[PDB]
Write a protein that binds this ligand. Structure first.
Ligand code: J2D
Ligand code: MG
Ligand code: MG
Ligand code: MG
Ligand code: MG
Ligand code: ZN
Length: 889
């Protein structure tokens, strides 16, 4: 079980300068011939030449056109090809090989595989070695010359990286295309695609050099009408990188390709980006609203990689967050600017503080730059991506836009065309910091702890105001809990964006201010503060931390109503909810533990409910924001605050609080649901696939949120509204009608209707599956069994499997049934999936991540299933490594 250590990085004893490939796709096998033009590096010490090569069938191998013979000159063990040093040349040489691989049966979707009728590759992180022999690490940079041949009727469209330089006919109904890609690249950016693809195309003219760039977006013929939004998003992405960062695309063509079978969202192969269909294809008739923001962010994300990851690449895989954290940060800047809605930033924070905070307090906790790995396929985590992005975003907060842009350009100009490490980025930012501080002794050495230290900091506050002195103080403390990675945690460089709100008129009392907390604690003093303020802390969520604001609910309400910052208003609301949840949770727990015949519950703060009404009734307030304030905090956010969480008692707690608020506000909810209809469901642009209105989508989100609240409440005659909603042309609406109808006798009527609307579009059917999976149904186990037998069957499509099972696992009452039947069901699915796709099997483990946070009976039930999975003789390396770490074994 080999463990790779970050401290152990050493350059290769070899160099690969040129790769020349011939990939010949046939009915039952694919033959791959490769010539590697190689050299001996300055670091060479006469070692054996060892290539990565996994699952390859050797037809022959040769060095300088002399055939090597197995046993005497090389060994191959299905993982490593070892050529004994005595047979390795001591200057430039050519290594060649011919191997056979089998994309048709490659269900793990790594290396070269078949997705429906499309042949496609996925080489990040170490999948290139599943295609041919190589020294498969990102610092082995080479030029590529790639020829693909295939049956012309089955596979008329052939793509790889670089320029297509020849197209030719082959006897027996075949044809070939040659692609030459002269700029150096790492092998994880190699891609090839063959299929009967249809496309939309456009020409983009770059801002400064005025280069013509051809843009192509591809899919199977059936879905070619779902490609338009993606092409628009690509145009938008190019413009943003030009306008914000001054960066233009350097190649003459960019291809985007949708495939049905994909382990993740998309992949940034140079000039040839490959997408999960659910993150590239949409139409207003056949997609829910979420698809539109999804496609925007994922097209943007892969485009921004062309600089951050492709032109500046990675020295080694421990630097992953350097390209992923930075590209998520660039993706988020882009998405905020395109959507112009405050909920975009809020949604990022909501994700981080639920899913990533849970990971960071689990046995899986790691820093954004880990010290070791076993499985690279297990390294692509919300910590590396989303905490990485918040760490990349803090540089912008600290430096401000002008010096951030200066520092970023330093990074690009200094590292363009090369590999890089996290230190290279910190160094570029540090140079800008020196300039900003007018102080060449200033440094960001402490900032590096954000890369190495695991766990979420807790930042807490105390205040003091002297009315005679007009002097205000904010005392701040930071603390990170020790974990298995560091016994002693050090203080971080924490930027705290703050305002001070005058509680009498709601106005700002100071200019924009970012406190730089660099010690365990500090006191920040403000003079000439005319009245005692309410502090507005961590505006924009300015650091990835647990915020303990120590404000009263009266103070939080004032901020919720009158503060200028969307995040602090949302966080203030969040904190009011959490105080209530923790209080009611323990009142319910106590009643349970003590077997009480009667007891009391503390009601929801009535002034809080008044503030929600006030905001809801304000026509100038944002519909997206409104949808957040009527929703309780995510279960996975709440669990970070409760030990031995009894999920039944939490379910009862949430139910009580929702009922309290609905008992006061349901008539308001209904009135709004009706008044929002005209603008929310406006059909003016329903047949214009390039017109996307994020505000209007937020109005639909608000309506569908309100409808859910009124349905759960059995508001008088709401079923009438539900039935009319099922007739809406928008899938977000008519799928909503299915899940809110769970509380009525018409659920299976709506089940059949919406199935019939969904079944003939692959992606829509998957959205229907999710809607069913997440339905609040007492018979949800019987329903899941029906989906398995009637719709899912033995599909190996990850989208299908994830759609059926993951939403169900968020069902607090049912997934966590005290019998353990839900844990048993998901473990059976994990073990089944692990036989053919270990990466997705590990994704399906996600519900188990919080296992040691639950009540002791459920900890035991979850642990039993994980140990049962660990005992399967045929368990994959991925799944074994993951469960071993998760169960602290
Ligand atoms: O699709 C996503 N991430 C991919 C990415 O960063 N694209 O630029 C991504 C790509 C490949 C992998 C990956 C890693 C492996 F080790 C592996 F075997 C594999 F098949 C894919 C994981 C995530 C996320 C979801 C969509 O928005 C971007 C984040
Ligand atoms: Mg094989
Ligand atoms: Mg422009
Ligand atoms: Mg994203
Ligand atoms: Mg299918
Ligand atoms: Zn990425």
């Amino acid at each position: 079980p080999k463990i790779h250590y970050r401290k152990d990085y050493k350059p290769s004893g070899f160099i690969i300068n040129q790769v020349t490939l011939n990939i010949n796709i046939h009915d039952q096998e694919t033959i791959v011939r490769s010539v590697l033009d190689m050299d001996i590096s300055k670091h060479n010490v006469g070692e054996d030449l060892v290539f990565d090569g996994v699952g390859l069938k050797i037809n022959e191998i040769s060095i300088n056109n002399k055939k090597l013979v197995e046993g005497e000159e090389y060994t191959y063990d299905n993982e490593f090809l070892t050529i004994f040093s005595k047979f390795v040349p001591k200057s430039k040489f050519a290594f060649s090989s011919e191997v056979i691989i089998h994309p048709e049966t490659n269900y793990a979707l790594t290396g070269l595989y078949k997705s429906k009728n499309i042949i496609v590759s996925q080489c990040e992180a170490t999948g290139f070695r599943r295609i041919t022999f190589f020294i498969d690490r990102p610092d082995m940079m080479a030029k590529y010359d790639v020829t693909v041949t295939a049956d012309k009727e089955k596979y008329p469209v052939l793509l790889s990286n670089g320029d297509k330089v020849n197209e030719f006919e082959i006897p027996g109904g075949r044809h070939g295309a040659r692609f030459n890609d002269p700029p150096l690249k790492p092998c994880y950016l190699f891609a090839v695609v063959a299929g009967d693809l249809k496309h939309l195309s456009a020409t983009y003219i770059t801002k400064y050099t005025k280069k013509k760039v051809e843009l192509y977006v591809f899919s199977e013929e059936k879905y070619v009408s779902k490609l338009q939004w993606a092409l628009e998003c690509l145009k938008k992405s190019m413009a943003f990188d030009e306008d914000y960062f001054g960066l233009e695309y350097d190649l003459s063509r960019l291809n985007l390709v949708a495939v049905s079978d994909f382990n993740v969202g998309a992949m940034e192969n140079k000039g040839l980006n490959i997408f999960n269909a659910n993150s590239l294809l949409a139409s207003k008739k056949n997609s829910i609203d979420f698809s539109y923001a999804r496609i925007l962010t994922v097209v943007g994300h892969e485009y921004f990689h062309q600089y951050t990851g492709n032109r500046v690449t990675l020295r080694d895989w421990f630097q992953l967050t350097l390209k992923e954290g930075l590209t998520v940060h660039r993706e988020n800047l882009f998405s905020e600017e395109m959507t112009k809605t405050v909920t975009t930033r809020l949604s990022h924070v909501d994700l981080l503080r639920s899913v990533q905070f849970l990971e960071d307090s689990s046995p899986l906790s790691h820093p954004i730059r880990p010290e070791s790995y076993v499985s690279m396929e297990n390294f692509y985590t919300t910590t590396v991506y989303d905490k990485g992005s918040e760490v990349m975003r803090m540089y912008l907060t600290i430096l401000g836009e002008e010096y951030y842009k200066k520092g970023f350009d330093i990074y690009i100009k200094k590292n363009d065309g090369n590999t890089a490490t996290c230190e290279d980025f910190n160094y570029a930012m540090e140079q800008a910091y020196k300039m900003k501080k007018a102080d060449n002794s200033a440094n960001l050495n402490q900032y590096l702890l954000w890369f190495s230290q695991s766990g979420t900091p807790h930042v807490s506050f105390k205040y003091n105001y002297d009315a005679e002195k007009k002097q205000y103080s904010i005392h701040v403390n930071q603390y990170t809990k020790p974990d298995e990675n560091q016994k002693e945690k050090k203080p971080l460089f924490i930027p705290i964006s703050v305002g001070l709100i005058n509680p009498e008129n709601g106005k700002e009392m100071i200019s924009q201010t970012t406190l730089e907390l660099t010690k365990e604690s500090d006191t920040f003093v403000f003079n000439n503060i005319a009245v005692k303020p309410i502090p507005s802390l961590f505006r924009g969520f300015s650091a990835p931390v647990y915020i303990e604001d120590q404000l009263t609910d009266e103070e939080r309400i004032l901020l919720l109503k009158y503060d200028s910052d969307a995040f602090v208003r949302y966080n203030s609301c969040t904190n009011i909810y959490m105080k209530q949840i923790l209080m009611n949770y323990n009142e319910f727990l106590k009643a349970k533990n003590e077997k009480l015949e009667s007891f009391q519950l503390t009601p929801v703060n009535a002034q809080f409910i008044d503030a929600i009404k006030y905001l809801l009734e304000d026509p100038h307030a944002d519909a997206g924001f409104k949808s957040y304030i009527v929703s309780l905090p995510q279960d996975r956010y709440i669990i970070n605050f409760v030990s031995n969480l009894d999920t039944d008692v939490l379910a009862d707690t949430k139910e009580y609080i929702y009922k309290q608020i609905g008992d006061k506000l349901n008539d308001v909810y209904y009135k709004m649901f009706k008044s929002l209809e005209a603008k929310a469901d406006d059909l003016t642009y329903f047949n214009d696939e390039s017109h996307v209105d994020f505000d209007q989508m937020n109005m639909r989100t608000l309506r569908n949120t309100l409808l859910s609240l009124l349905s759960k409440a059995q508001y008088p005659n709401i079923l009438n509204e539900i039935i009319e909603h099922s007739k809406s042309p928008y899938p977000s609406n008519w799928l909503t009608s299915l899940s809110v109808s769970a509380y009525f006798d018409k659920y299976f009527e709506l089940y059949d209707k919406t199935y019939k609307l969904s079944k003939d579009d692959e992606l829509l059917l998957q959205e229907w599956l999710k809607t069913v999976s997440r339905s609040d149904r007492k018979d949800i186990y019987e329903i899941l069994k029906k989906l398995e037998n009637e719709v899912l069957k033995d599909s190996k499509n990850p989208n299908d499997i994830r759609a059926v099972y993951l939403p169900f696992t968020n069902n607090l009452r049912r997934f966590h049934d005290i019998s353990g039947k839900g844990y048993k069901l998901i473990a059976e699915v994990i073990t089944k999936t692990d036989k053919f796709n270990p990466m997705v099997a590990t994704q399906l483990c996600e519900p188990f991540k919080l296992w040691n946070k639950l009540d002791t009976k459920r900890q035991e039930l979850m642990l039993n299933e994980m140990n049962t999975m660990l005992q399967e003789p045929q368990i994959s390396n991925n799944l074994k490594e993951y469960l071993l770490r998760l169960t602290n074994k």
